[PDB]
């Protein structure tokens, strides 16, 4: 009936060879804040992370090795009505 | 004297206790855990919020919110366990409560019936109170933890909460349990009775003071002076109670148990289809208690009671009480006498012997009993199985005389209580005897010997004596004298009657009896104590 | 350890108890009597009514006999109501003797405990006295309601109840309400768990804990009272909020004697925004509120913490603790948030005991009289026997000292911090002389041989460090002293102070002499004293 | 205002030489019932008594020795609002 993930959609919208900008359609739940993780696909290079406030619907990642496959994941944390912890959404981009 | 059924109960109650003690500690743990979660989430949010003010987007690690998501999962697994252990407890407690209410308590409600009509009085509701209280404290503890879960849920919840889904039935269950256990613990301890006729409970004459007492077997001090009992009669021929009509349960007993005694009650008829000594009424006692937020209506009632205009009606009334309580155990059957059941002699015999053990040292022998069998049934021996109608026992007259069986006997007992009680005790009155055994018995012994028995000729009930003259054919004839009634015995004691008694056989006055009481006994020895001047 | 004052209280309480037991029994008789009256009047009235349908049923003798028993029970009602007011007075006295004396003594012994030394009596035996009186008051409440019952049933133009009961009720309610508000106490004062020695100082964003008790041990109340905690309820000053788990429900299985407690462990503070006193002098109250409904009586409760200092950063704690020391040493009012607008003055004789406490609270030995009199010189100026001298808040903290860059108290807090975390063993065994005039430092050591040395704290640094001092000797015969630049927290991470001492050497002619240290002060060879602590 | 006797007034209205008839005010209180006593004033003969319902405002006494001084007293019993027992009223009549 409904798409279950944290944000329902996730895309990249502008991109330079060393940085991306991501947008997710604005959530119907009340998100306290999101985590954003990106890492080289298959690597044992550890994963990079930062937070964005629930306010926002986009962040920029930078410092990307240009042509490599990055796995980008967005997590959300909800407490407003009750605690939620929705399952996240990922995409793969190479720049 | 403790049965095995009871020492097992005693164990179930201690098992229920420790079960709830364990849950109470399991919830300090599940409370700790959700506090830990909630605290950490908010601290890590005001921090992943406030330091975003100053530019910083790397304060709160994903590791620490995988660790938080995981401790939410843990406590849901614990909430899950707890709510099913709780329902597990509730089932244990529903079982223990049947075995209290439907067995051990119903056994007392009955032993009480037997006690009322003369039987061994088992009563002592003490050990029954301790079991009910032990289970009610357990249930209260349990109530507090099921409210505890409501508290936890407001604080911390989520889409699948085991509490949102299962608690509502856990509450429903523990409330029905507690409400029902309190309604069952509200019992009439001493059944209504006019103080001047103690042997005749459940018969109330109008305009006479009677008394009754209720107990509540949940020994919770929270409830002292908190419950006002309103007594009445015939709640929806018909009556009212007058006097002091509300009383407030206190614990100044006995064992500091929650009682409330009504003295100061009388009945008045108000302004009609079954004869009055068979028309039954209930005296109901109502109160309400508010306990830690729970309203709990209470209502118990007396055993059915016969209500009468005049004291001449009491033998028929008591008959009705004997017939009711001997035969049913339903406490609220007002319409019992529209289709009375039948009783076996083997039950009726024990009740009659009780009307004489209840009131005197002796009770009735098997010779005495078997001759009363002949009065109810007709001739025979070993009546064990024979059955007895309400009509044979009181409603219809007997053996072509003008009166009931029961009325004859009530009046005889009344006579043995108030006059000649000393002679009944100690067995100088062989009261119930066939004329043929009266003869066969005395034939054996010398011609002066004599015997004391009750009249069969009068509703009123009197006593007489019988001796044996012997004749020229060699046969033994009996003589009995016109029996001495309540009206003769006000002016002389029966024993004094016996010493002084003489008869005129030709000429002059000999002492007919004044020689021996049945078994070889000089007369002075047997009634010398009552001569006095 | 029982006072005589207390065993007399213990007697008053058994006396109030049997007084009320007697009244409850005196009211079973007064109840019996009015039942007898009422029953007989209605009996003889339905009879002198029903038989009129025969006008000689009810004798005038029997209505004189009734009139006279009404009079009797009014004479009894009269007696009861004054015995009752008699009881109420007895109970008001016992209650000021509990609230205003024995309880106020504990509320204070608690203040002292908070700033070091004499850890108080537990509340257990204070609880049993308060419950003993509350049960007595309850029993009394029930009998004053009993009289309301009797009145509805049987009354008349002069009723002693109609006239006097209303004040009897007023009295027993004020008594009970007040005894319960007084029994609602903070048992363990707010405190951050990782700075136990610093109660009543709360850093923002750190978890702290506090615990309340209710000293009326009535099981009727288990799981019935939800305590809401907050801060800055209801001034030209800063405001905060509590975050975390903010309500708790008093139970009885948490405490060993089954007492009614409620422990808050998940509390933190956050400052709130808006438009007097530096922050280490600005005081706040943490308040705890609940409501109880007991047998028809509503009873609002509210108690609060001792005043607490709230700080941004841990560098602020020595000033904060100074404020707590100054407050609790000097006043016993628990709610004076504006104490520091006109701080009072203290005598040295009381300041001395508090400083020795800052060292007994935290270690195996407090401060000596030599150690103490040399801290006197730091606060006042030169002299001997300071007993009366008075000490300002300005001399103690707030203003710097003896023309150095820092407060007295800050210097000492930092020294204590150093004694706690490094060097604690040597303090405990009394190998550190610590506080000593330079002149006694010289006079003391001159008697002794040229190796001998002593350990003392730096006076040069807020930071707080230790050093040692020894005696070279010169041709005139005089004794010279050397001290070394003191060893701070920053040096002692990498070597233990005892290791420093043994290994230490400085220069002779051209080669690094070997220790200038040889003996610890009173005739004691160096290895003998610091061998235990080296490698 | 005031006057505390149970009936406020009491008089005899008709009389034969062996009997009297007495009337009092209907009472402002709610009288359960009254007692009526009459006795020969010096007489150490005992006093005679009977009841009338609160309903009534008159009773008849009879069997009087004609010329003798009788002391007549009326008592009332009140419980309606609360128990009362007002003081009684007596008069002396000789017939």
Author numbering:
A (entry chain D), D (entry chain C): -1 to 93
B (entry chain A): 136 to 371, 382 to 398, 400 to 417, 428 to 689
C (entry chain B): 136 to 188, 191 to 371, 379 to 419, 429 to 688
Sentences from the paper on this structure:
Here, we develop monobodies to different STAT3 domains to interfere with critical cellular and pathophysiological processes. In contrast to the monobodies previously developed against several other SH2 domain-containing oncogenes, none of the tested STAT3 monobodies target the SH2 domain, but instead bind the CC domain and inhibit transcriptional activity of STAT3. The recombinant monobodies expressed in E. coli with high yield and solubility and size exclusion chromatography coupled to multi-angle light scattering (SEC-MALS) indicated the formation of a monodisperse 1:1 complex with STAT3-CF when the two components were mixed. We found a dominantly enthalpically driven binding (∆H = −22.5 ± 0.5 kcal/mol) with a binding stoichiometry of 1:1 and an ensuing high binding affinity (KD = 7.6 ± 4.5 nM). Two monobodies bind one STAT3 dimer, in line with the 1:1 binding stoichiometry determined by ITC. Inducible expression of MS3-6-VHL fusions in NPM-ALK expressing mouse thymoma cells resulted in the degradation of endogenous STAT3 protein. STAT3 degradation by MS3-6-VHL was impaired upon proteasome inhibition, indicating ubiquitin-dependent proteasomal degradation. This alternative STAT3 stimulation is mediated by the constitutive interaction between the CC of STAT3 and the 84 C-terminal amino acids of the IL-22R, which lack tyrosine residues.
STAT3 shares sequence and structural homology with other STAT family members and is composed of six domains: N-terminal domain (NTD), coiled-coil domain (CC), DNA-binding domain (DBD), linker domain (LD), Src homology 2 domain (SH2) and transactivation domain (TAD). Canonical STAT3 activation relies on the phosphorylation of a key tyrosine residue by JAKs, Y705, which results in SH2 domain-mediated STAT3 dimerization.
